[PDB]
Amino acid sequence: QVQLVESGGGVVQPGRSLRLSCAASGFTLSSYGMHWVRQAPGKGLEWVAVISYDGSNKYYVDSVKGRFTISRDNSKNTLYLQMNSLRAEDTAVYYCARGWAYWELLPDYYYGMDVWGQGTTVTVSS
């Protein structure tokens, strides 16, 4: 079934790194775009990492420019969110959402976030 499962959550000390894994089942990653959403409890969701279907370009938010890296493996349909320079406020529940496909000709500022999994949170404290 079309599902995005996030693995790699836990306690990472400040200043360290982590490669958060996102495994996709049912659909092909190269045909759809992804959205990374940070959702802290009791507050609003926030957009961090997004990648197009073809990986032709990289988009992020200002707070995460040059400090988080997202990479893809289309050979086996896998996603690797590399975490760098973690801080205590990064603790939130992260969801991976799926963007629309090129099979349907859609305009730019591509629409996405149609389906997403349970998500996984991170813990950065010392």
Partner 1 sequence: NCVADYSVLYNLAPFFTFKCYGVSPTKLNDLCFTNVYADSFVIRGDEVRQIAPGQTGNIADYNYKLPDDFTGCVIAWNSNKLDSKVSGNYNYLYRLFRKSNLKPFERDISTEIYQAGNKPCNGVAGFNCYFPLRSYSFRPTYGVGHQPYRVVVLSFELLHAPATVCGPKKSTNLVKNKCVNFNFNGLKGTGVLTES
Partner 2 sequence: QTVVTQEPSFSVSPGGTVTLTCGLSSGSVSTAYFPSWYQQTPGQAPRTLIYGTNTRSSGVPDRFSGSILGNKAALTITGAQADDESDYYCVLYMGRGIVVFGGGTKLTVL
Is 66 a binding residue for partner 1 by CB under 8 A? The answer is no
Is the Cβ–Cβ distance between 86 and 18 less than 8 Å?
Answer: yes
Is 108 a binding residue for partner 1 by CB under 8 A? The answer is yes
Please choose, from the candidates 45, 46, 75, 76, the residue with its C-alpha nearest in 3D space to the C-alpha of residue 62.
46
Binding mask 66-85 for partner 2 (x = CB under 8 A): --------------------
Q: How many CB atoms lie within 10 A of CB 1?
A: 5
Give the interface segment with partner 1, choosing from 8-16, 26-34, 101-109, 112-120 (CB under 8 A): 101-109
Give the interface segment with partner 1, choosing from 39-47, 48-56, 75-83, 104-112 (CB under 8 A): 104-112
Sign of CA dihedral 27, 30, 31, 37: positive
Is 117 a binding residue for partner 2 by CB under 8 A? The answer is yes
